[PDB]
mmCIF file with all atom_site columns, C-alpha atoms and ligand atoms in Angstrom:
data_model
loop_
_atom_site.group_PDB
_atom_site.id
_atom_site.type_symbol
_atom_site.label_atom_id
_atom_site.label_alt_id
_atom_site.label_comp_id
_atom_site.label_asym_id
_atom_site.label_entity_id
_atom_site.label_seq_id
_atom_site.pdbx_PDB_ins_code
_atom_site.Cartn_x
_atom_site.Cartn_y
_atom_site.Cartn_z
_atom_site.occupancy
_atom_site.B_iso_or_equiv
_atom_site.pdbx_formal_charge
_atom_site.auth_seq_id
_atom_site.auth_comp_id
_atom_site.auth_asym_id
_atom_site.auth_atom_id
_atom_site.pdbx_PDB_model_num
ATOM   1   C  CA  . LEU A 1 1   ? -12.864 -13.326 0.087   1.00 33.24 ? 238 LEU A CA  1
ATOM   2   C  CA  . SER A 1 2   ? -14.018 -9.857  -0.880  1.00 33.62 ? 239 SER A CA  1
ATOM   3   C  CA  . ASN A 1 3   ? -11.294 -6.605  -1.936  1.00 32.06 ? 240 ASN A CA  1
ATOM   4   C  CA  . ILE A 1 4   ? -12.440 -4.211  0.359   1.00 33.79 ? 241 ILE A CA  1
ATOM   5   C  CA  . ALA A 1 5   ? -9.367  -1.210  -0.616  1.00 34.55 ? 242 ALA A CA  1
ATOM   6   C  CA  . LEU A 1 6   ? -11.653 -0.582  -3.818  1.00 30.71 ? 243 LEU A CA  1
ATOM   7   C  CA  . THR A 1 7   ? -12.233 2.751   -3.725  1.00 28.02 ? 244 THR A CA  1
ATOM   8   C  CA  . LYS A 1 8   ? -11.460 3.112   0.320   1.00 25.82 ? 245 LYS A CA  1
ATOM   9   C  CA  . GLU A 1 9   ? -10.109 6.692   1.642   1.00 26.81 ? 246 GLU A CA  1
ATOM   10  C  CA  . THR A 1 10  ? -6.797  6.799   0.159   1.00 26.03 ? 247 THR A CA  1
ATOM   11  C  CA  . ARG A 1 11  ? -3.856  9.440   1.381   1.00 27.03 ? 248 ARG A CA  1
ATOM   12  C  CA  . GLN A 1 12  ? -0.388  9.401   1.036   1.00 28.96 ? 249 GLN A CA  1
ATOM   13  C  CA  . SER A 1 13  ? 3.063   11.412  2.222   1.00 31.54 ? 250 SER A CA  1
ATOM   14  C  CA  . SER A 1 14  ? 2.634   13.734  -1.013  1.00 29.43 ? 251 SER A CA  1
ATOM   15  C  CA  . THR A 1 15  ? 2.166   13.632  -4.780  1.00 31.81 ? 252 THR A CA  1
ATOM   16  C  CA  . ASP A 1 16  ? 3.893   13.693  -7.978  1.00 35.81 ? 253 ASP A CA  1
ATOM   17  C  CA  . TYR A 1 17  ? 3.652   12.718  -11.895 1.00 36.92 ? 254 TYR A CA  1
ATOM   18  C  CA  . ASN A 1 18  ? 0.142   12.352  -11.591 1.00 40.87 ? 255 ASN A CA  1
ATOM   19  C  CA  . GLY A 1 19  ? 0.576   9.481   -9.634  1.00 40.55 ? 256 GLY A CA  1
ATOM   20  C  CA  . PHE A 1 20  ? -2.784  10.071  -6.971  1.00 40.98 ? 257 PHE A CA  1
ATOM   21  C  CA  . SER A 1 21  ? -3.160  7.913   -3.895  1.00 41.54 ? 258 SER A CA  1
ATOM   22  C  CA  . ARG A 1 22  ? -6.765  6.759   -5.131  1.00 39.87 ? 259 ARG A CA  1
ATOM   23  C  CA  . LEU A 1 23  ? -4.880  4.663   -7.865  1.00 38.54 ? 260 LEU A CA  1
ATOM   24  C  CA  . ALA A 1 24  ? -3.775  1.861   -5.487  1.00 41.64 ? 261 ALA A CA  1
ATOM   25  C  CA  . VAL A 1 25  ? -7.101  0.933   -4.864  1.00 46.94 ? 262 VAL A CA  1
ATOM   26  C  CA  . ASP A 1 26  ? -8.896  1.578   -8.614  1.00 42.45 ? 263 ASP A CA  1
ATOM   27  C  CA  . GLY A 1 27  ? -9.102  -2.220  -9.243  1.00 45.78 ? 264 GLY A CA  1
ATOM   28  C  CA  . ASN A 1 28  ? -6.486  -2.603  -11.623 1.00 47.96 ? 265 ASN A CA  1
ATOM   29  C  CA  . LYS A 1 29  ? -3.196  -4.066  -10.998 1.00 45.02 ? 266 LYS A CA  1
ATOM   30  C  CA  . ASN A 1 30  ? -1.403  -2.947  -14.374 1.00 46.75 ? 267 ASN A CA  1
ATOM   31  C  CA  . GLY A 1 31  ? 2.072   -1.424  -12.607 1.00 46.03 ? 268 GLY A CA  1
ATOM   32  C  CA  . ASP A 1 32  ? 3.270   0.093   -16.021 1.00 41.37 ? 269 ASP A CA  1
ATOM   33  C  CA  . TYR A 1 33  ? 3.031   3.695   -14.705 1.00 40.50 ? 270 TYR A CA  1
ATOM   34  C  CA  . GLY A 1 34  ? 2.112   4.923   -18.345 1.00 38.73 ? 271 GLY A CA  1
ATOM   35  C  CA  . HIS A 1 35  ? -1.252  2.738   -17.447 1.00 33.92 ? 272 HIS A CA  1
ATOM   36  C  CA  . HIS A 1 36  ? -2.244  5.561   -15.276 1.00 34.46 ? 273 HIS A CA  1
ATOM   37  C  CA  . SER A 1 37  ? -3.236  3.036   -12.490 1.00 33.98 ? 274 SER A CA  1
ATOM   38  C  CA  . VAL A 1 38  ? 0.441   3.762   -10.394 1.00 32.87 ? 275 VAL A CA  1
ATOM   39  C  CA  . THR A 1 39  ? 0.784   5.538   -7.438  1.00 31.33 ? 276 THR A CA  1
ATOM   40  C  CA  . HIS A 1 40  ? 4.443   7.801   -7.146  1.00 33.41 ? 277 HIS A CA  1
ATOM   41  C  CA  . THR A 1 41  ? 5.002   10.157  -3.948  1.00 34.76 ? 278 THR A CA  1
ATOM   42  C  CA  . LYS A 1 42  ? 7.904   13.006  -3.729  1.00 33.46 ? 279 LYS A CA  1
ATOM   43  C  CA  . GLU A 1 43  ? 11.747  12.151  -2.878  1.00 31.83 ? 280 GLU A CA  1
ATOM   44  C  CA  . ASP A 1 44  ? 9.620   12.291  0.678   1.00 29.94 ? 281 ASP A CA  1
ATOM   45  C  CA  . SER A 1 45  ? 11.769  11.338  4.356   1.00 29.83 ? 282 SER A CA  1
ATOM   46  C  CA  . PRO A 1 46  ? 9.921   8.728   4.167   1.00 32.22 ? 283 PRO A CA  1
ATOM   47  C  CA  . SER A 1 47  ? 7.584   8.018   1.830   1.00 32.31 ? 284 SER A CA  1
ATOM   48  C  CA  . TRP A 1 48  ? 4.285   6.122   3.008   1.00 35.31 ? 285 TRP A CA  1
ATOM   49  C  CA  . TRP A 1 49  ? 1.060   5.657   1.470   1.00 33.72 ? 286 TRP A CA  1
ATOM   50  C  CA  . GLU A 1 50  ? -2.012  4.689   3.887   1.00 35.46 ? 287 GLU A CA  1
ATOM   51  C  CA  . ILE A 1 51  ? -5.824  3.643   3.724   1.00 32.07 ? 288 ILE A CA  1
ATOM   52  C  CA  . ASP A 1 52  ? -8.237  4.225   5.956   1.00 29.90 ? 289 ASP A CA  1
ATOM   53  C  CA  . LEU A 1 53  ? -11.061 1.330   5.540   1.00 27.55 ? 290 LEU A CA  1
ATOM   54  C  CA  . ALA A 1 54  ? -13.682 3.582   7.118   1.00 24.06 ? 291 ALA A CA  1
ATOM   55  C  CA  . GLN A 1 55  ? -14.126 1.051   10.189  1.00 23.18 ? 292 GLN A CA  1
ATOM   56  C  CA  . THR A 1 56  ? -12.600 -2.032  11.604  1.00 27.58 ? 293 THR A CA  1
ATOM   57  C  CA  . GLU A 1 57  ? -12.351 -5.153  9.413   1.00 27.06 ? 294 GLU A CA  1
ATOM   58  C  CA  . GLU A 1 58  ? -11.384 -8.873  9.825   1.00 28.16 ? 295 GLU A CA  1
ATOM   59  C  CA  . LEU A 1 59  ? -8.501  -8.655  7.913   1.00 25.38 ? 296 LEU A CA  1
ATOM   60  C  CA  . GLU A 1 60  ? -7.684  -11.828 5.784   1.00 24.37 ? 297 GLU A CA  1
ATOM   61  C  CA  . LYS A 1 61  ? -4.716  -11.402 3.451   1.00 28.18 ? 298 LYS A CA  1
ATOM   62  C  CA  . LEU A 1 62  ? -2.599  -8.095  2.169   1.00 29.70 ? 299 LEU A CA  1
ATOM   63  C  CA  . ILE A 1 63  ? -1.568  -8.195  -1.381  1.00 28.31 ? 300 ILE A CA  1
ATOM   64  C  CA  . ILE A 1 64  ? 0.689   -5.490  -3.045  1.00 28.49 ? 301 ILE A CA  1
ATOM   65  C  CA  . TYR A 1 65  ? 1.349   -5.086  -6.392  1.00 27.26 ? 302 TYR A CA  1
ATOM   66  C  CA  . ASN A 1 66  ? 4.483   -2.831  -7.288  1.00 29.45 ? 303 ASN A CA  1
ATOM   67  C  CA  . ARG A 1 67  ? 5.433   -0.878  -10.163 1.00 28.96 ? 304 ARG A CA  1
ATOM   68  C  CA  . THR A 1 68  ? 6.457   -2.975  -13.022 1.00 29.64 ? 305 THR A CA  1
ATOM   69  C  CA  . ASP A 1 69  ? 7.938   -0.492  -16.047 1.00 31.03 ? 306 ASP A CA  1
ATOM   70  C  CA  . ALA A 1 70  ? 11.253  1.418   -14.094 1.00 30.31 ? 307 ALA A CA  1
ATOM   71  C  CA  . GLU A 1 71  ? 13.053  1.639   -10.909 1.00 32.80 ? 308 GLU A CA  1
ATOM   72  C  CA  . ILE A 1 72  ? 10.496  -1.777  -9.286  1.00 33.66 ? 309 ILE A CA  1
ATOM   73  C  CA  . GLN A 1 73  ? 13.798  -1.424  -6.433  1.00 33.12 ? 310 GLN A CA  1
ATOM   74  C  CA  . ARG A 1 74  ? 11.835  1.247   -5.243  1.00 32.04 ? 311 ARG A CA  1
ATOM   75  C  CA  . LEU A 1 75  ? 9.165   -1.200  -2.963  1.00 34.65 ? 312 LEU A CA  1
ATOM   76  C  CA  . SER A 1 76  ? 11.931  -2.697  -1.450  1.00 31.96 ? 313 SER A CA  1
ATOM   77  C  CA  . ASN A 1 77  ? 12.862  -2.344  3.224   1.00 30.86 ? 314 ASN A CA  1
ATOM   78  C  CA  . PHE A 1 78  ? 9.899   -1.211  3.943   1.00 27.96 ? 315 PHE A CA  1
ATOM   79  C  CA  . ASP A 1 79  ? 7.432   -1.544  6.653   1.00 29.99 ? 316 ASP A CA  1
ATOM   80  C  CA  . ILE A 1 80  ? 3.883   -2.586  6.681   1.00 31.00 ? 317 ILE A CA  1
ATOM   81  C  CA  . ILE A 1 81  ? 1.674   -1.088  9.191   1.00 30.48 ? 318 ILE A CA  1
ATOM   82  C  CA  . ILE A 1 82  ? -1.916  -2.143  10.683  1.00 33.81 ? 319 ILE A CA  1
ATOM   83  C  CA  . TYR A 1 83  ? -3.140  0.180   12.816  1.00 29.50 ? 320 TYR A CA  1
ATOM   84  C  CA  . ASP A 1 84  ? -7.126  -0.221  14.975  1.00 29.69 ? 321 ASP A CA  1
ATOM   85  C  CA  . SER A 1 85  ? -9.901  2.596   15.139  1.00 29.35 ? 322 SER A CA  1
ATOM   86  C  CA  . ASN A 1 86  ? -7.891  4.079   17.402  1.00 31.75 ? 323 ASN A CA  1
ATOM   87  C  CA  . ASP A 1 87  ? -4.618  4.634   15.392  1.00 30.49 ? 324 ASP A CA  1
ATOM   88  C  CA  . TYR A 1 88  ? -2.712  2.755   17.327  1.00 27.62 ? 325 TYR A CA  1
ATOM   89  C  CA  . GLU A 1 89  ? -0.623  0.132   15.907  1.00 31.43 ? 326 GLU A CA  1
ATOM   90  C  CA  . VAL A 1 90  ? -2.159  -3.806  15.888  1.00 31.35 ? 327 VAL A CA  1
ATOM   91  C  CA  . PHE A 1 91  ? 0.824   -5.562  13.647  1.00 32.92 ? 328 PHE A CA  1
ATOM   92  C  CA  . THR A 1 92  ? 4.084   -4.345  11.573  1.00 31.63 ? 329 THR A CA  1
ATOM   93  C  CA  . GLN A 1 93  ? 6.033   -6.092  9.362   1.00 29.57 ? 330 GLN A CA  1
ATOM   94  C  CA  . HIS A 1 94  ? 9.313   -5.211  7.918   1.00 28.97 ? 331 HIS A CA  1
ATOM   95  C  CA  . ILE A 1 95  ? 9.679   -6.338  4.175   1.00 26.36 ? 332 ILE A CA  1
ATOM   96  C  CA  . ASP A 1 96  ? 13.573  -6.420  3.045   1.00 27.23 ? 333 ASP A CA  1
ATOM   97  C  CA  . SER A 1 97  ? 12.646  -7.051  -1.075  1.00 28.62 ? 334 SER A CA  1
ATOM   98  C  CA  . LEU A 1 98  ? 9.567   -7.796  -3.586  1.00 29.18 ? 335 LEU A CA  1
ATOM   99  C  CA  . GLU A 1 99  ? 11.260  -10.884 -5.514  1.00 28.85 ? 336 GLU A CA  1
ATOM   100 C  CA  . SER A 1 100 ? 7.967   -11.070 -8.272  1.00 27.99 ? 337 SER A CA  1
ATOM   101 C  CA  . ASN A 1 101 ? 5.603   -8.296  -8.900  1.00 27.67 ? 338 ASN A CA  1
ATOM   102 C  CA  . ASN A 1 102 ? 4.018   -8.554  -5.624  1.00 26.66 ? 339 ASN A CA  1
ATOM   103 C  CA  . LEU A 1 103 ? 3.300   -9.853  -2.453  1.00 26.54 ? 340 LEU A CA  1
ATOM   104 C  CA  . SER A 1 104 ? 0.903   -11.778 -0.215  1.00 29.76 ? 341 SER A CA  1
ATOM   105 C  CA  . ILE A 1 105 ? 0.313   -11.488 2.865   1.00 28.90 ? 342 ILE A CA  1
ATOM   106 C  CA  . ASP A 1 106 ? -2.184  -13.672 5.518   1.00 27.77 ? 343 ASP A CA  1
ATOM   107 C  CA  . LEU A 1 107 ? -3.446  -12.022 8.164   1.00 26.27 ? 344 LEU A CA  1
ATOM   108 C  CA  . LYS A 1 108 ? -5.824  -14.550 9.491   1.00 26.15 ? 345 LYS A CA  1
ATOM   109 C  CA  . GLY A 1 109 ? -8.856  -12.396 10.487  1.00 28.53 ? 346 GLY A CA  1
ATOM   110 C  CA  . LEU A 1 110 ? -6.418  -9.604  12.498  1.00 29.78 ? 347 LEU A CA  1
ATOM   111 C  CA  . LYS A 1 111 ? -8.867  -6.541  13.277  1.00 28.39 ? 348 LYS A CA  1
ATOM   112 C  CA  . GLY A 1 112 ? -7.402  -3.354  11.786  1.00 28.82 ? 349 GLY A CA  1
ATOM   113 C  CA  . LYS A 1 113 ? -9.045  0.086   10.563  1.00 26.42 ? 350 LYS A CA  1
ATOM   114 C  CA  . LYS A 1 114 ? -5.922  1.554   8.758   1.00 26.35 ? 351 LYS A CA  1
ATOM   115 C  CA  . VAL A 1 115 ? -3.153  -0.148  6.662   1.00 25.80 ? 352 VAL A CA  1
ATOM   116 C  CA  . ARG A 1 116 ? -0.300  2.225   6.311   1.00 27.98 ? 353 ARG A CA  1
ATOM   117 C  CA  . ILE A 1 117 ? 3.005   1.033   4.022   1.00 27.18 ? 354 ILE A CA  1
ATOM   118 C  CA  . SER A 1 118 ? 6.289   3.304   4.615   1.00 26.85 ? 355 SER A CA  1
ATOM   119 C  CA  . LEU A 1 119 ? 10.448  3.078   2.994   1.00 27.82 ? 356 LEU A CA  1
ATOM   120 C  CA  . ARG A 1 120 ? 12.514  3.032   5.330   1.00 27.02 ? 357 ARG A CA  1
ATOM   121 C  CA  . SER A 1 121 ? 15.175  4.680   3.353   1.00 28.53 ? 358 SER A CA  1
ATOM   122 C  CA  . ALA A 1 122 ? 14.316  8.529   2.941   1.00 25.57 ? 359 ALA A CA  1
ATOM   123 C  CA  . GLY A 1 123 ? 14.584  10.205  -0.016  1.00 25.18 ? 360 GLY A CA  1
ATOM   124 C  CA  . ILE A 1 124 ? 13.020  6.991   -2.382  1.00 21.66 ? 361 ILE A CA  1
ATOM   125 C  CA  . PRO A 1 125 ? 9.230   8.187   -3.603  1.00 23.26 ? 362 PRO A CA  1
ATOM   126 C  CA  . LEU A 1 126 ? 7.192   4.934   -3.096  1.00 25.18 ? 363 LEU A CA  1
ATOM   127 C  CA  . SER A 1 127 ? 5.093   3.902   -6.394  1.00 25.31 ? 364 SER A CA  1
ATOM   128 C  CA  . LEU A 1 128 ? 2.385   0.909   -5.628  1.00 24.85 ? 365 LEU A CA  1
ATOM   129 C  CA  . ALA A 1 129 ? 0.573   -0.720  -8.846  1.00 26.98 ? 366 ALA A CA  1
ATOM   130 C  CA  . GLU A 1 130 ? -2.469  -1.861  -5.955  1.00 30.56 ? 367 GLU A CA  1
ATOM   131 C  CA  . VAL A 1 131 ? -2.851  -2.311  -3.044  1.00 34.21 ? 368 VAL A CA  1
ATOM   132 C  CA  . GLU A 1 132 ? -5.838  -5.580  -2.154  1.00 33.30 ? 369 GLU A CA  1
ATOM   133 C  CA  . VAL A 1 133 ? -7.409  -5.912  1.113   1.00 33.50 ? 370 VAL A CA  1
ATOM   134 C  CA  . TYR A 1 134 ? -9.276  -9.074  1.586   1.00 38.04 ? 371 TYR A CA  1
ATOM   135 C  CA  . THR A 1 135 ? -11.852 -9.983  4.205   1.00 36.00 ? 372 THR A CA  1
ATOM   136 C  CA  . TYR A 1 136 ? -14.397 -13.172 4.553   1.00 32.40 ? 373 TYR A CA  1
ATOM   137 C  CA  . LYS A 1 137 ? -12.590 -15.743 5.003   1.00 31.62 ? 374 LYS A CA  1
HETATM 138 CA CA1 . CA  B 2 .   ? -4.264  0.524   -9.453  1.00 31.77 ? 666 CA  B CA1 1
#
């Protein structure tokens, strides 16, 4: 397995507090906001974040690392949406809440090019410490 998320092109609904979208693919899973490795949107309707894998890949695993210092509850009631190279949805999963600072999803070789994480409660900022996307097997 290799983490092909690293340094892929990212974007998000908006940015607050220097929480750039790229911070979720910098290879640093520290969720303490002041360690400067956690994304942050404004209070959007909805807040979302997206990664472009640059071409279609066989996806083995997705790992999402939450913020940990404060407001950890914000990463809850959300959707993970995977799209093909033509921007059509190929997979959706709804998440009620995280119990630990992270969630792992096996994708069993699902082919996709883009991954969006989008909150279903409007007004809530999205903050991610790290989103890792594994291919290989
Ligand atoms: Ca990070």
